[PDB]
Structures are given as structure tokens and as C-alpha cells.
């Protein structure tokens, strides 16, 4: 809608207070005009019809519990936009400042979030397995990273290429979590998963096997469920990424860490320059080695650590 840019205040899913960019025209709308062609947040009103209604509020204060998921979807979309722009010189997901749209209150008791090819969608959770999914910045950045991948490499969402697609989303969701410095870690979804149980998460990058996901290629899932294991076999790539950043010894192979900033630069280059829709794990390894070579030279420690990390998870 057309109106005056302003700033409102509200409380997110975890009860923290934050300022959000809104637009004023009779009502105050969750429309942020300060970032590219805008960030727009919608109310799906517990239905599955999308996008729903652009979120309208009478007083620019968003402290109702119904408001919480919208506040966080809108705010964390902004943070994720800022990360891609400031760190990777990328303007929104398509690289030309496309509008970012999110709907919250999708369906009833819906325990997931997703990018649907056009926008992000967030369930409220059922209150025991999940709380509203937009409360996790690693979740928001995971989903919007799917948009980035779709516009670049185009990795198909099945088998190894789909597992790479999901790992990339976990890797950048994590890097955005560190960027915002909100109690960052190498776990996925810990802020919105099982509000009854402290210390757990949906997936772990530092130790995927903690939740039964593979941490070595010899342990890959080869069946048909979950589109050939796209959320399962991602653990193999996630572990590799964790090793490249943080270092460690894994199945007897030692990796010297090169830190988060370089991990992001190498993977962003691989993604945007070398990966294609049908890339498999072996091709990811070559793309990552070539990226590190482009950036730091073929005899660098950075290339050495990328090779060691993939040797450690059994990807040749
Ligand atoms: Ca209000
Ligand atoms: Ca965290
Ligand atoms: Ca996390
Ligand atoms: Ca929990
Ligand atoms: Zn995903």
C-alpha cells in the first residue's frame, strides 16, 4: 500500500521487545519500505489460502499474543535481508531487490514453515512440538535462503541435490543467527522446538548424529522417504561446514578451522557461481574447493581445510 514510513514497537514470540518498520495509511501495516522493494507480512488467519491479508494494526503497537509471530517474521526477514546485503553484496533473494513476503498463522496447529516458490509461510505450531516458527531467526533465514538457492543454483529438492539445498539453508540460517548475535549456536530451531524440553533442537550441525542424522557419507540414507532424505543426509554436509569453520577431528581426520566469515564466503561463491540444479555431494566438494581457490589461492590453508573437512565426512 502507499503511505508514510514509520516505526512501531511490539513483542515477539519469545517475549522480547523490538522496533519494526511499518507503513501508515489509515491503519499501520507491516510493510517495511526501507529494504529493497519492501518486506510485507500477512495474516493467513488460520486458513491455508495464501497470502491472506496484509497485516493491519490500529495503533502501531504490537503487544497482543496474536501479533507475536508477525512481529518476528517481519523483523527477522529484515535482519536476513541485511545479512545478504552487507556481507555478500546481494540485494534480496533474486539479487534485484524483490519484495519479501511472509504469511503467519498458517493453518491450525501447523508444525512447519516453508518457502513455497513465491513467499515464506509460518505455522503456529501445536504448542508442544513447536511454538510459532517465526520465533527462530535460524528458521526464518533457513527458509529465505531457499529463495536464494532457487534463484541461483536451482538445486532440485530430491536426493543429493536436495540434501545440499537443505544444508545450504541450515548453514546460512546459522550464519545469520551469528550475525544477529542472538544466543548463536550450531543447532537448528532450538528457540521454537519443544517448549517443554530445554537443551534440544531439530537438527545439530556440530553433531548431527545426536538426533540420528548421518555425519558421514557411509551412513547416508538411500531410501525414498523425505524426498530421498533431503532433511536427513543434509547432516553430512552440515558436519563438513561445521568442521571447516570450527575445526576438529572427526573419524580420525583432523581439520583446522578457518572461521565463520570465510565459511560463508566460500559457500556463497560455490552456490552462486558453481552449483547447478543436479549437483551431487562430490560436485559440491569440487565447487567448494574451486571457490576457496578463487578466493585464497590453491596453496592456502583455506583450500586445505575444505579438503580435509570433506575427507572427514567421506565425500570424495
Ligand atoms: Ca495494536
Ligand atoms: Ca540459538
Ligand atoms: Ca540455532
Ligand atoms: Ca526444546
Ligand atoms: Zn529447508
CA dist., res. 311 & res. 259, Å (int): 18
142 CA distance to ligand 5 middle (Å): 6
Query: In whole angstroms, how far apart are CA 244 and each of 10, 266, 273?
Result: 38, 10, 20
Residue that has been written with the C-alpha cell 529484515 in this structure = 78
CA dist., res. 257 & res. 187, Å (int): 18
The phi, psi pair for 306, rounded to 5°, reads: -60, -45
**With b meaning 16 or more CB within 10 Å and e meaning fewer, what string describes 267-288?**
bbbbbbebbeeebebebbbebb
The residues spanned by each domain of the chain are 6-154, 155-315
297 CA distance to ligand 5 middle (Å): 32
**Residues whose CB is under 5 A from ligand 5 (ion)?**
166, 169
CA dihedral 70, 73, 78, 82 (to 10 degrees): 170
Grid cell digits, residue 36:
529493497
**Angle, vertex CA 175, rays to CA 190 and CA 171, nearest 5:** 75
134 CA distance to ligand 1 middle (Å): 19
Beta-bridge partners for 249: 254
In this structure, what DSSP letter does residue 300 have? S
| Deposited experimental method | X-ray
Relative to the alpha carbon of 206, which ligand is closest? 3
CATH of domain 6-154: 3.10.170.10
CA dist., res. 12 & res. 206, Å (int): 28
Grid cell digits, residue 286:
569440487
CA dist., res. 161 & res. 283, Å (int): 10
230 CA distance to ligand 5 middle (Å): 9
283 contacts 164 by C-beta, under 8 angstroms: no
71 CA distance to ligand 3 middle (Å): 19
46 contacts 26 by C-beta, under 8 angstroms: no
DSSP 112-153: -EEE-SS-EEEE---SSSBS-GGG-HHHHHHHHHHHHHHHTT
**Residues whose CB is under 5 A from ligand 1 (ion)?**
57, 59, 61
Neighbours of 200 (CB within 10 A): 14
N- to C-terminal Cα distance for the chain? 52
Quick check: do 6-154 and 155-315 share a fold?
no
The phi, psi pair for 248, rounded to 5°, reads: 145, 175
273 CA distance to ligand 4 middle (Å): 37
Please give the annotated binding residues for Zn(2+), written as ranges: 142, 146, 166
Q: What is the resolution of this structure in A?
A: 2.0
Annotated active-site positions, please?
A: 143, 231
The domain defined by 155-315 carries CATH number 1.10.390.10: yes
Please give the annotated binding residues for Ca(2+), written as ranges: 57, 59, 61, 138, 177, 183, 185, 187, 190, 193-194, 197, 200
Residue that has been written with the C-alpha cell 522496533 in this structure = 19
Amino acid at each position: 500500500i502507499t503511505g508514510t514510513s514509520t516505526v512501531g514497537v511490539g513483542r515477539g514470540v519469545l517475549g522480547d521487545q523490538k522496533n519494526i518498520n511499518t507503513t501508515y495509511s489509515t491503519y499501520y501495516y507491516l510493510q517495511d519500505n526501507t529494504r529493497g522493494n519492501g518486506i510485507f507480512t500477512y495474516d493467513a488467519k488460520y486458513r491455508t489460502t495464501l497470502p491472506g491479508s496484509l497485516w493491519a494494526d490500529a495503533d502501531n503497537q504490537f503487544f497482543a499474543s496474536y501479533d507475536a509471530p508477525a512481529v518476528d517474521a517481519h523483523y527477522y526477514a529484515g535482519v536476513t535481508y541485511d545479512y545478504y546485503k552487507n556481507v555478500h553484496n546481494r540485494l534480496s533473494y533474486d539479487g534485484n531487490n524483490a519484495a519479501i513476503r511472509s504469511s503467519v498463522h498458517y493453518s491450525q496447529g501447523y508444525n512447519n514453515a516453508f518457502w513455497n516458490g513465491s513467499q515464506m509461510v509460518y505455522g503456529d505450531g501445536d504448542g508442544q512440538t513447536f511454538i510459532p516458527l517465526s520465533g527462530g531467526i535460524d528458521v526464518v533465514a533457513h527458509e529465505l535462503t531457499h529463495a536464494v538457492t532457487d534463484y541461483t543454483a536451482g538445486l532440485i529438492y530430491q536426493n543429493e541435490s536436495g540434501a545440499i539445498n537443505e544444508a545450504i539453508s541450515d548453514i546460512f540460517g546459522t550464519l545469520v543467527e551469528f550475525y544477529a548475535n542472538k544466543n548463536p549456536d550450531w543447532e537448528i530451531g532450538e528457540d521454537v522446538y519443544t517448549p517443554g524440553i530445554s537443551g534440544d533442537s531439530l537438527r545439530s550441525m556440530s553433531d548431527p548424529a545426536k538426533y540420528g542424522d548421518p555425519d558421514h557419507y557411509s551412513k547416508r540414507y538411500t531410501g525414498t522417504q523425505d524426498n530421498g532424505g533431503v532433511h536427513i543426509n543434509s547432516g553430512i554436509i552440515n558436519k563438513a561446514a561445521y568442521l571447516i569453520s570450527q575445526g576438529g577431528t572427526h573419524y580420525g581426520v583432523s581439520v583446522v578451522g578457518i572461521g565463520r566469515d570465510k565459511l560463508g564466503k566460500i559457500f556463497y561463491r560455490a552456490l552462486t557461481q558453481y552449483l547447478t540444479p543436479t549437483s551431487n555431494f562430490s560436485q559440491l566438494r569440487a565447487a567448494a574447493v574451486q571457490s576457496a581457490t578463487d578466493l585464497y589461492g590453491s596453496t592456502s590453508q583455506e583450500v586445505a581445510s575444505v579438503k580435509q573437512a570433506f575427507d572427514a565426512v567421506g565425500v570424495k
